[model samples]
Target: MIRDIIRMGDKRLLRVAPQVTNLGSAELHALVSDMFETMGAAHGVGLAAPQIAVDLQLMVFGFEASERYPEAPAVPLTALANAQIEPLSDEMENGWEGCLSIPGLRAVIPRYRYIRYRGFAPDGSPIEREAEGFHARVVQHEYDHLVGRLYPSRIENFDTFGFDDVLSYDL
Candidate 1:
């Protein structure tokens, strides 16, 4: 089920997602599977339920042997039921990121250099994890979507870097 990805301007994309309480529900399981399939088809590093207009706090992200972005480390593919992220450091780094919902535009957003998170595994068991570097960036990026925030919204200076500039940086 390749769902329609809600775009940046969509009202649903701006609303904060609701926490998913019933991870065991068939609907949730189906949604998680659909998200992974859709994300892989789109060649995205991450995908959130809201991106498909579900409005639930669920997301999937991993590197998983992707050839397009070979530098990304192989992370175990995960389906988070209800996730929370806490930054481990105030230090921020600007990195180019694009979203499946925000197609055709990539932006440089300041993100925490490290993060600690807790969430339910696909089978509904609790798991705590920490990530850094590219993995940390991936987690932060998707978590923003759950809170009704998009990468471009946090762009430091959009005018200074146009599409040409982004292309020059190989974003």
Candidate 2:
């Protein structure tokens, strides 16, 4: 089931999503499967429940190799729910990011260079890990959707935001 990804400006994308209380339910398992399928179909590194118009704090992200992030290292496939993001430091790094919801556009946004995320896996097991660089960025990017934020909203300079082809950064 490839759910439709809601685009930016949709009011649903602006509302903070609620927790997934039924963590290990069959319904959640099916939704996570659908999200992975949808993300793969769209060639996206990540997908949030809100992106598909579901008001839940759930996100799936990972890839062995991605056309959109060719040079980036592989991130393990994960389905995380009710995530809590904690920056390891005040240091920030800027990188190019594109979202499934914000199609055809890319922006340079600053994110924590290192972070520790605590959350539940699709099966309701506790999961915590520290990530850095692109991994951290991806986690932060997807987590933003849970809190009613789009990558463009994190842009510090409008000059760095534009269509994908117009930007010189490699995919």
Candidate 3:
């Protein structure tokens, strides 16, 4: 089920998405499948339940390779629920980001260079991992959606934000 991804102006994207208590329920499984399908359909590297108009703290992200980010490294496919992310250091890096919710727009946003994330798999198994570089960025990006934050909100300057097609750098 590829759901209609709600755009930036949708108020649903502003409210904090609540946690999913039913880790392994049939409904959760279905939603996870739908998120993957939705992401693939939109060529999105990451997605949150809120983007699909489901107010749950769930996110799916990863890619073996991405045409949108041709030079980036691969991240393992993951569906995380009720996730928490902690920056490993004070370091921050700026990178180009786009979202399914934001459509053709792109922005240069600052993200933690490294992070430790803890969460649960759909089956309720514990998951803890350290990530850096593109992997870390992807985790933080999707996690933002759970907290009602978009990449554009992290942009420090409007000059670096524009349409993907107009951006000089490869996105």
Task: Find the candidate with the highest lDDT and give its number.
Answer: 2
Residue lDDT tens for model 1, 62-95: 8678744676778778888678999998989877
Off-target runs (Cα >4 Å) in candidate 1 are: 159-166
lDDT of 3 by residue, 1-171 (tens): 889999998999888988889998899999999999999888888899999999999999999988799988889999999999999999998888899898889888889999999999998899999999889999999998888888877989788899988778543
Q: Rate the local accuracy (lDDT) of all candidates.
A: 0.81, 0.92, 0.90
Better structure of 1 and 2 per lDDT: 2
Estimate the TM-score of every prediction. Answer: 0.90, 0.96, 0.96
> How close is each model in CA RMSD to the real structure?
2.1, 1.4, 1.3
Assess candidate 1 and give its TM-score to the true structure.
0.90
Q: Candidate 2 residues 34-79, lDDT tens each?
A: 9999999999998999999999999999999999989899999999
Candidate 2 lDDT at 48 equals 93
- Ranking of all predicted structures according to lDDT, beginning with the best and ending with the worst: 2, 3, 1
- Runs in model 2 deviating more than 4 A are 169-171
Off by over 4 Å in 3: 169-171
